[PDB]
């Protein structure tokens with residue numbers, strides 16, 4: 370009834386898996402080959418022709434951020450957004466902030482030397498804003514448990530850790546971002562996340578490969 | 585009680601005015617000087633330091649797309665989004681699609697000659713997808729009346745018309761995009777929009793000026 374088209378290393382696909390598993394929704398994972406895309410993926414998502422795509426009752430929903438809100442509205446139990454409109458707007462604001470800065474991270478895989486060290490400092494600054502103004506002193510962006518904001522920022526855990534190791538740069542460190550680093554450790558320790566993350570060695574292998582073609 | 589910080593020519597500020605006026609919400613418009621920004625705008629929006637910013641009960645909400653959903657949730661009467669989760673996801677999807685392509689339009693103010701004619705054809709293609717897959721045969725993106733999707737695409741009416749006249753290119757034409765062009769005319773004819781759009785001559789003067797510095 371619920372099908373998920375996506376990659377086994379994509380952080381965007383994992384956001385959807387986390388949300389469905391937090392809701393207790395049974396789903397079939399359909400592995401999408403990037404070199405040979407199926408007839409379903411080209412008709413379900415004709416605009417971007419990219420993953421992830423959620424299919425519910427044969428109807429497709431693309432773009433992980435739209436998918437996350439569809440899951441929240443379709444399965445309202447175990448809420449992943451607050452009910453207060455101002456708090457919901459702040460959650461949307463931080464999610465959009467992360468989505469806009471998912472471009473400054475690309476410079477970590479293209480630049481080198483003193484140009485790479487400039488890109489790393491820019492990413493640290495983006496993370497510091499998120500830490501100070503978004504997370505604050507809460508355990509999670511969702512307060513005492515993870516919400517859509519934590520899910521949207523989960524890529525700053527093992528995916529960012531793999532990029533840091535592939536490019537030889539340090540960005541999310543305890544000395545510079547103590548609260549965000551403590552959050553990243555707590556996020557990965559949440560049993561739902563721990564049981565549903567890609568193998569680090571396989572993910573690191575992929576990030577090294579991506580860095581290679583991006584120079 | 586409700587204050588709006590924004591520009592008198594910005595399409596993003598007009599989206600917010602339309603939504604507040606469709607809800608019957610009394611608000612004070614605070615004109616924001618770009619050369620000399622007030623102490624309020626720098627504290628209310630410390631992340632982008634940009635307009636528009638809605639302030640409700642002294643609390644700021646930035647980013648027109650987050651603001652539009654806050655207005656919809658705070659004043660739920662006269663709905664501007666459908667109740668069905670799939671239809672709401674499709675509205676969010678098209679809004680995000682327009683927000684992502686609000687970069688291909690920038691090439692209309694930077695390129696010239698055969699490079700400008702390439703940018704115009706790219707924008708026509710973006711609009712054709714919106715027309716075929718988003719609008720279809722409906723009078724408005726919201727069906728029989730305007731919704732958040734129409735509001736988010738209102739910049740394709742007189743703002744796009746001013747860019748077309750400033751750059752000497754044709755993008756949204758009746759021969760090539762008949763349904764989207766008919767929509768653009770119907771949108772501008774809606775009394776709420778007609779009574780709340782910038783003066784065309786002043787807007788054209790601004791677009792010519794923006795084209796100048798962007799080359």
Ligand SMILES: O=c1c(O)c(-c2ccccc2)oc2cc(O)cc(O)c12
Pocket residue numbers: 376378379380471472474475524525528529532575
């Ligand atoms: O833009 C990103 C991206 O596309 C992917 C990715 C990795 C593996 C497979 C497919 C996609 O991971 C990221 C991880 C990040 O910490 C930051 C990003 O900016 C990205």
Ligand SMILES: O=c1c(O)c(-c2ccccc2)oc2cc(O)cc(O)c12
Pocket residue numbers: 591593594595686687689690739740743744747790
């Ligand atoms: O990105 C845009 C933009 O910033 C403005 C603008 C105009 C006047 C004053 C302030 C902002 O208008 C647009 C109009 C469009 O049809 C498309 C755009 O891509 C834009």
Ligand SMILES: [Cl-]
Pocket residue numbers: 381420421432433434
């Ligand atoms: Cl995505």
Ligand SMILES: [Cl-]
Pocket residue numbers: 596635636647648649
């Ligand atoms: Cl905006």
